Symmetry: D3
Subunit: 150 residues, 6 copies
């Protein structure tokens, strides 16, 4: 359905490097609709809950550390196959290996500072969305451009 | 001081036309820092409180009406003389009379649908900011690029 | 009713310098609608008819000469106060004196090679439009973004 | 030889979403030359003739339907291997599966509304060109930037 | 004559904020030709010689100080009325008072950190050029796009 | 330690087509730091020394010929894995086969006129760097954005 939603977040480096507008603009141009948007400073709780799947990973330390060292602009986009498309537009985990045209490919160089993050599946999305947004912080009335869908 | 803050809001038409990223990007490029950011649907209360100065104005009707017909992404930018600069970057009330290069000048044509709004004075700002954001929704730790100020 | 239409034309230098897309994109971004569009090579007739008002002027020679030395993409845009707005976005006759942000201001340096031309009044428009386009080469069903006007 | 030509067309959704300039600009930047350009509203004849190869596929219905629901800006570009290159710049049939950087990859989400179409072979080109343009609507004197070729 | 040349320099903050390409790109788009280009770290000598006219003003101190705190990419552009046009594209001394569309207007906020500097007269140019470049570091064979001039 | 440096050069066609700013801007946006930058006209010596590996190749003739037919802006960028990343951003030898988003993919069409060149290995880099720049023409104090690496 055209109501699939994904969770995306501009990490501290992204926000600090002034890439918030640029990134949002890409998804707006793609046709996806913004249903949730806000800036905050992740709490160590939220951080570990979010990256829960890596708690036993060597990098989990600095990750949670960094992810809370400054503001993060979290957002939710809605659209047909947005979860898979958003990832594609982001690139791969290593910015250096990301193709030109993708977000990481155009702006990053270090795996630790890769500008943005986003849900890797509809499952992970729903979870991460609920985890970061309160029900009333998300639109319900989503009306996209009529020139978008058939 | 370099801690001046202004209130800016992408009106429904702006948000609907997909200009959120583009607009934010301009202020980020200018050097101003994002201290507050969120999307919501203005309530008739907030609407009238915001445009309180025009309650006796002929257009006050449709204004408050429209301003709540859909999502609005409100935001707060901080920086040296941001209130006056932000207005300058916006243009004048009538998009048609706004110079190329300014936001309204580049995207609008109707006074009723002029993409964005912003505080016209430090006074109006403080008021509008407090009016739209809750104290904890705004950063306190604002560290701009060091290449920005002397 | 606000369907005012204007005639704009990317002169040979503009077309040759590959600025067609760029220029169209600006007016599209502004909100104006494209009702007529085509590329051709002006005939000495059309040329003199077009610049009829300068037939006794000392430059009329090279003008008509140049304006037909290569392709020209003529177009018609429709929208509220488009004639005046389009001129504003173009700049002034001398590119060097045109402000940054305007078309001539951003791309030209010589009065003889100023990238684009456009009707300077609703009168001149109607005349120039009819002069360059055949009635069936122009849309009649013009439906703009429902977010542009109120 | 650098005389190869291809047929490209901004479909109604593309035109309606205001992507005409943007798209033309990409091909101009690539180095290809514009030999034919015009806006029109496809007739059911032209439509079926164009998509003749799909008269049986379960989508031929809505396709021809849509392709004529509004203006389309058809165009012809000339240059070394333009047919294959143009397709590459477009992406694949499904916008969601198209890579960032390509036209569909950057602007579309639905297979039915994929912004643009273009000849898939020199054969299909010649046919589609002749089908859409009258001989005198195409330049013959094509002089590209000298810096493009060896 | 279209031989006029001006001296422009991206100051340390500009270079540090990664605006070198962006700035050069503007002048290239305008039609001016690059005759000299290089990156270096101004010496206190060069610095004071350059800003010789301000040796008394209360800011000459930090100015010379800053202008040598890091790399600077100096450059020379050639073209009809380039000195006046370049300044226009830069804006005014105070970035906050510079119009959107101009370099300072779009990227700076502090008079002390105004991204770029440029000769304010043909006189000042010749002097500053000779002062920063060695005769063989400047082209002599300057051939601009033929579409720029009449 | 990640100060890997690479040598890149905007060939005559690139410089002539006015793509210098655009190209530099991409690498600046990527996060790489500019350590060396200058414009010159390659001497037949430098040319053959540079393309030494192709002296017996059938194209070596016109190559060296062209590479010295006009100005070239040589530059050195420093950053984590810059040599491999820079190549990726450039595309493949044939512009037509280069993906959208890469430099050649977006601007070139002919293998002979492919806008830019860059070291294909750390080995080739060191060699080409030393070959094109004098030790004091390269920075030593390289301080990148503190947000780029962890
Ligand atoms: N050194 C490594 O092997 C490694 N893997 C991940 N990381 C850092 O941790 C974040 C999450 O890792 P993931 O494997 O989920 O990658 P991702 O899917 O691209 O990231 P995200 O969840 O933040 O969108 C990554 O975004 C990155 O900052 N380092
Ligand atoms: N028809 C009129 O004369 C008129 N004046 C204002 N308006 C609509 O009401 C909004 C607020 O008016 P203001 O005079 O405050 O203009 P503004 O300062 O540019 O707007 P804002 O407060 O929304 O930033 C305007 O932004 C516009 O949408 N119509
Ligand atoms: N040297 C002069 O004083 C002079 N005045 C005009 N011109 C050339 O002639 C074209 C037509 O003159 P106009 O005064 O009508 O220019 P415009 O109103 O700015 O633009 P356009 O005619 O092309 O729509 C101009 O666009 C320009 O190329 N040279
Ligand atoms: N639902 C489907 O399975 C399907 N297949 C095609 N389509 C729509 O019909 C157009 C023509 O199909 P093609 O396979 O020829 O697409 P194309 O090669 O990418 O583009 P075009 O014909 O429009 O140049 C496509 O561009 C697309 O709009 N829908
Ligand atoms: N605080 C002040 O009153 C003041 N005045 C000048 N400045 C700094 O010194 C630079 C030189 O002053 P100018 O008045 O010559 O500025 P300009 O004409 O815009 O630029 P430039 O000399 O750097 O080409 C200015 O560009 C600016 O960085 N601060
Ligand atoms: N026709 C051919 O098969 C052929 N191969 C190379 N060339 C021309 O010679 C330049 C140098 O060849 P390379 O294979 O080293 O190219 P590259 O590695 O992609 O780039 P560069 O040498 O310029 O850094 C190429 O950039 C290209 O202009 N033509
Ligand atoms: Mg993950
Ligand atoms: Mg107001
Ligand atoms: Mg006129
Ligand atoms: Mg097909
Ligand atoms: Mg000065
Ligand atoms: Mg090589």
């Amino acid at each position: 359905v055209n109501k699939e939603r994904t969770f995306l977040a501009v990490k501290p480096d992204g926000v600090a490097r002034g890439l918030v507008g640029e990134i949002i603009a890409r998804y707006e141009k793609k046709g996806f609709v913004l249903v949730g948007l806000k800036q905050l400073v992740p709490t160590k709780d939220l951080a570990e809950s979010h990256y829960a799947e890596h708690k036993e990973r060597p990098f989990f330390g600095g990750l949670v550390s960094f992810i809370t060292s400054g503001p993060v602009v979290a957002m939710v986009f809605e659209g047909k196959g947005v979860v898979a498309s958003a990832r594609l537009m982001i690139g791969v985990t290593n910015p250096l290996a990301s193709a030109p045209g993708s977000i990481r490919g155009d702006f990053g160089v270090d795996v630790g500072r890769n500008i943005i993050g986003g849900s890797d599946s509809v499952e992970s999305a729903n979870r991460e969305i609920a985890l970061w947004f309160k029900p009333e912080e998300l639109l319900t009335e989503v009306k996209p451009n009529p020139n978008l869908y058939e």
